[PDB]
Design a protein around this ligand. Structure first.
Ligand SMILES: CC(C)(C)Nc1nnc(-c2ccc3[nH]cc(-c4nccc(C5CC5)n4)c3c2)o1
Length: 273
């Protein structure tokens, strides 16, 4: 099944719950990415329409797959005795937003606006299709350098979206909201908005605002870089301590800092080429 259909490049990276290889489909030469998940390391098992037990990442990616390219395409998946293999789209040339920010330091605001807008569009699409990612960060965002288009990746910490409380959490501590640190309780939308504020701060400052649990709970945001007041306001709003004080996605995208956003293609010519 697999060996025939795909040629395997080197490793692209690995985290908890996954290892990802660069790869090529032999039939069309289409660039792919090949993700392997060990069954013994899966803490959160999903179920398909078929009534078949597979990793949650597969459930979530199937639920969001259609014309929309702000989320990574799941092309195919396989089961093996001890593992699962996911075939995912791979743009070329591409670069991880974590590496991209590392290289450039603070992003100019025009570029941050485009990037953050596209992530917001992506996350809205996820919620629309019933999916909550739970690990929004620079590491889980890819830049298609030719098209200036961003893509959410790694739904291995994700869950079905629900409007009731979540008591489990598998994503990145430093990106997690204060309600999780203190009460091991949160709600999806409000918690995602927090992690997006961490993301925006990362984009405009070159680094994340908080390292320890104590700083997260204090919720005081210091800017080490020149950032506009409109941008500051938005970040501080997303990073409100009390979830109900956080903006909704509509209110984020209607904020004054998010006006006159560049199209992706414009974003590439000015900022990436
Ligand atoms: C832990 C991590 C980020 C490796 N998990 C992950 N899960 N899926 C991917 C994933 C899926 C499709 C992809 N297509 C292209 C990449 C890729 N390209 C360049 C650099 C990177 C590194 C962060 C992994 N990924 C890709 C990754 O990564």
């Amino acid at each position: 099944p697999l060996e025939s259909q795909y040629q395997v490049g080197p490793l692209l990276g690995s985290g908890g719950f996954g290892s990802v290889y660069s790869g090529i489909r032999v039939s069309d030469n289409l660039p792919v990415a090949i993700k392997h998940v060990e069954k013994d390391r899966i803490s959160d098992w999903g179920e398909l329409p078929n009534g078949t037990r597979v990793p949650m990442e597969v459930v979530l990616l199937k639920k969001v797959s259609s014309g929309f390219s702000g989320v990574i395409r799941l092309l195919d998946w396989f089961e093996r005795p001890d593992s699962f293999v996911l075939i995912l789209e791979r743009p070329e040339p591409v670069q991880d937003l974590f590496d991209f920010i590392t290289e450039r330091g603070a992003l100019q605001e025009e570029l941050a606006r485009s990037f953050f807008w596209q992530v917001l569009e992506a996350v809205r699409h996820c919620h629309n299709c019933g999916v909550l990612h739970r690990d929004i960060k620079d590491e889980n965002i890819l830049i298609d350098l030719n098209r200036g288009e961003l893509k959410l990746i790694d739904f291995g910490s994700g869950a079905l979206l629900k409007d009731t409380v979540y008591t489990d959490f598998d994503g990145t501590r430093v990106y997690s909201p204060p309600e999780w640190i203190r009460y091991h309780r949160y709600h999806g939308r409000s918690a995602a908005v927090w992690s997006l504020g961490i993301l925006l701060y990362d984009m405009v400052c070159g680094d994340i605002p908080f390292e320890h649990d104590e700083e997260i709970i204090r919720g005081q945001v210091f800017f080490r870089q020149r950032v506009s007041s409109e941008c500051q306001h938005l970040i501080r709003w997303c990073l409100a301590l009390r979830p109900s004080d956080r903006p909704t996605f509509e209110e984020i995208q209607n904020h004054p800092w998010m006006q006159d956003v560049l199209l992706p293609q414009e974003t590439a010519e000015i900022h990436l080429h």
